[PDB]
Amino acid sequence: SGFRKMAFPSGKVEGCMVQVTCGTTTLNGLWLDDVVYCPRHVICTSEDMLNPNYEDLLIRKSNHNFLVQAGNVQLRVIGHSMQNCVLKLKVDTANPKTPKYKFVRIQPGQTFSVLACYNGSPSGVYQCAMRPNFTIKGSFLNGSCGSVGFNIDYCVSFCYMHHMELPTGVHAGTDLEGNFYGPFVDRQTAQAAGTDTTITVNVLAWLYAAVINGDRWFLNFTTTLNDFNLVAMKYNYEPLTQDHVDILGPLSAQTGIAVLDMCASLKELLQNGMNGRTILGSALLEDEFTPFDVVRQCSGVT
Amino acid sequence: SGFRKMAFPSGKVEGCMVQVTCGTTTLNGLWLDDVVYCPRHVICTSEDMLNPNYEDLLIRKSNHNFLVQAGNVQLRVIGHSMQNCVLKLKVDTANPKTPKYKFVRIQPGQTFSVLACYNGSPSGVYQCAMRPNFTIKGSFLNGSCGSVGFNIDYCVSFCYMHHMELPTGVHAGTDLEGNFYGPFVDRQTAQAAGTDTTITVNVLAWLYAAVINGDRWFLNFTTTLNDFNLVAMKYNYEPLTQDHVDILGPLSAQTGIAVLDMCASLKELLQNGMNGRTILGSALLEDEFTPFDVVRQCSGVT
Numbered sequence: 001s002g003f004r005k006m007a008f009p010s011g012k013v014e015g016c017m018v019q020v021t022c023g024t025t026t027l028n029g030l031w032l033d034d035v036v037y038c039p040r041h042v043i044c045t046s047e048d049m050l051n052p053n054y055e056d057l058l059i060r061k062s063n064h065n066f067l068v069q070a071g072n073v074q075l076r077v078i079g080h081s082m083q084n085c086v087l088k089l090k091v092d093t094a095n096p097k098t099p100k101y102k103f104v105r106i107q108p109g110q111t112f113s114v115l116a117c118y119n120g121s122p123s124g125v126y127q128c129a130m131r132p133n134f135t136i137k138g139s140f141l142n143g144s145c146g147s148v149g150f151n152i153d154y155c156v157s158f159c160y161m162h163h164m165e166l167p168t169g170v171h172a173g174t175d176l177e178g179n180f181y182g183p184f185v186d187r188q189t190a191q192a193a194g195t196d197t198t199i200t201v202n203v204l205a206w207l208y209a210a211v212i213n214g215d216r217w218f219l220n221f222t223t224t225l226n227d228f229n230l231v232a233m234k235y236n237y238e239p240l241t242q243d244h245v246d247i248l249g250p251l252s253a254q255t256g257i258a259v260l261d262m263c264a265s266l267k268e269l270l271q272n273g274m275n276g277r278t279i280l281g282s283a284l285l286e287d288e289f290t291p292f293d294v295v296r297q298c299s300g301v302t
Numbered sequence: 303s304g305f306r307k308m309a310f311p312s313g314k315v316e317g318c319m320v321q322v323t324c325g326t327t328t329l330n331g332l333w334l335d336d337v338v339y340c341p342r343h344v345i346c347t348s349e350d351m352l353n354p355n356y357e358d359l360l361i362r363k364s365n366h367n368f369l370v371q372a373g374n375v376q377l378r379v380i381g382h383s384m385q386n387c388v389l390k391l392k393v394d395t396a397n398p399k400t401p402k403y404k405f406v407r408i409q410p411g412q413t414f415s416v417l418a419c420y421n422g423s424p425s426g427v428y429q430c431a432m433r434p435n436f437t438i439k440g441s442f443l444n445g446s447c448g449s450v451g452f453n454i455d456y457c458v459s460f461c462y463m464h465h466m467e468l469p470t471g472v473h474a475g476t477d478l479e480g481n482f483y484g485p486f487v488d489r490q491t492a493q494a495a496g497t498d499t500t501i502t503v504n505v506l507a508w509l510y511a512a513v514i515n516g517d518r519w520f521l522n523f524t525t526t527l528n529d530f531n532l533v534a535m536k537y538n539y540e541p542l543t544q545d546h547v548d549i550l551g552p553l554s555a556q557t558g559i560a561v562l563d564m565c566a567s568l569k570e571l572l573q574n575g576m577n578g579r580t581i582l583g584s585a586l587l588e589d590e591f592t593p594f595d596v597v598r599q600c601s602g603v604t
């Protein structure tokens with residue numbers, strides 16, 4: 001029994017983390033085969049970050065201007081190019097620790113594990129979700145740039161590289177092809193995220209995890225997808241699609257509660273609050289577990 | 303910025319996880335050098351667990367009755383002994399992936415990372431605390447027995463091996479010398495944990511993490527260690543010692559708030575509740591961060 005915010009084991013990603021230095025700036029990079037991936041703003045001084053012309057700034061740079069360090073070893077840069085907001089530094093050594101991997105662009109609401117790093121060394125791992133407004137609420141200090149987010153599908157699917165913190169204190173970054181998630185650019189200006197919404201299909205997945213673990217005080221009614229969605233829009237919950245009802249099916253089958261019945265329970269929680277109770281140790285509705293996360297934890301995928 | 307329940311990177315422990323089989327039972331073991339460590343109840347059938355005589359049960363067993371598997375490799379058992387509630391199976395191969403390590407018995411209130419495993423394969427990692435009543439609120443399914451908890455001090459300090467779930471749904475286990483934490487025995491009977499209490503020094507550490515991250519709405523008064531402790535005992539908070547005030551000193555020095563001032567803020571939160579607000583995204587007072595955890599996260603120890 002029990003339910004925890006669980007991250008994937010991080011061993012496979014640790015052996016890929018290197019420290020990249022250009023000029024005075026040092027951040028983390030991802031070394032797979034003979035390429036090293038890092039945020040392109042490593043080439044920027046602080047004057048540069050107000051209005052960086054990245055092409056122009058990168059043109060002034062040659063291979064030997066990049067100090068890639070792997071542990072104590074120093075790698076040799078024999079090539080550099082800029083794919084979107086990511087720098088690709090080709091080096092002289094294939095990483096012998098390269099796992100099977102894919103690069104993946106995840107969807108808002110999906111979860112992934114983050115290995116937070118500084119100067120190329122891992123410091124901690126945690127689980128989080130891509131918010132509907134394409135930000136993440138992470139834990140990132142200066143020099144954590146280039147820390148990666150990932151899933152393990154038995155193969156490492158890298159989905160996120162950290163670039164920047166917004167004055168909000170929320171975090172933004174790119175996929176491993178350098179395309180930002182969200183409307184953000186790698187520049188030090190005022191950038192607004194959208195209004196955030198709650199991942200409704202994830203909250204329902206968690207209520208099922210709650211029932212699986214003996215927490216059932218919130219159950220009861222029914223409602224319609226259409227009727228439920230009217231309550232959700234009022235509470236800044238993201239609208240429940242039928243894909244979403246389908247994804248919850250196996251969870252429905254193992255608790256013997258129809259999705260639509262579970263939504264009626266949620267509607268009452270949204271309308272009436274929690275009246276001081278807790279669900280799985282939380283006094284709030286938790287939205288950072290996908291249905292796949294719940295099933296992975298509640299039957300032990302390794 | 304940002305604050306997350308962060309676990310240590312798990313790479314070093316993954317390369318130590320093996321699958322141990324005796325009879326029909328299969329659980330996880332810890333392979334360091336030429337010894338493999340696992341819960342001794344691996345030798346038990348289900349009839350045995352009501353009233354196991356472990357010496358007698360282990361006497362019927364010979365080395366070849368133990369199937370230790372490391373990945374696909376099968377290790378050769380050339381020795382077996384029982385230290386308290388742990389079995390020590392000596393094998394023919396030193397593990398080439400053995401990190402620098404120590405065995406450590408932690409104290410109630412300390413935190414550690416758990417690598418949850420099944421059949422010798424890692425599935426997830428999470429951070430938790432030894433409760434004052436020596437239980438842990440984990441996430442453990444059948445066959446997760448022998449999963450280990452650990453800290454990384456730059457060296458892996460193993461502090462916990464999981465043995466059993468109580469009807470509560472909370473979890474109990476031993477140090478790596480096989481001595482249970484708490485009053486528990488490895489037997490399937492009714493076993494009561496103590497009344498649980500809140501780790502007061504950890505809650506204060508979290509309020510400091512809250513201030514560090516811009517959440518300051520709860521600040522204000524003063525009070526005395528003696529006066530504060532009177533409020534704590536009423537709310538089932540563990541009493542604040544002067545060691546505890548000392549440990550919080552560096553946190554005090556960097557936020558410019560005296561410990562005793564922070565306690566006055568907490569007293570009012572305990573007495574008056576949170577009135578619907580949140581602190582660092584939580585609607586409850588969080589007690590699973592030590593002051594060392596807060597300092598590790600808020601300045602990036604790797």
Ligand SMILES: O=C1N[C@@]2(CCc3ccccc32)C(=O)N1c1cncc2ccccc12
Binds near residue numbers: 049145165186303
């Ligand atoms: O937030 C930013 N803006 C910076 C400088 C401006 C910029 C432009 C493009 C990309 C990143 C950045 C940057 O390097 N970071 C950081 C990212 N993560 C954690 C941080 C913790 C403390 C201070 C900065 C942090």
Ligand SMILES: O=C1N[C@@]2(CCc3ccccc32)C(=O)N1c1cncc2ccccc12
Binds near residue numbers: 443445447
């Ligand atoms: O709780 C127990 N009691 C058992 C059998 C009785 C016993 C005696 C000594 C030690 C352990 C045990 C056991 O193997 N476990 C488990 C431990 N962890 C997660 C579990 C999830 C689901 C079912 C069991 C779980």
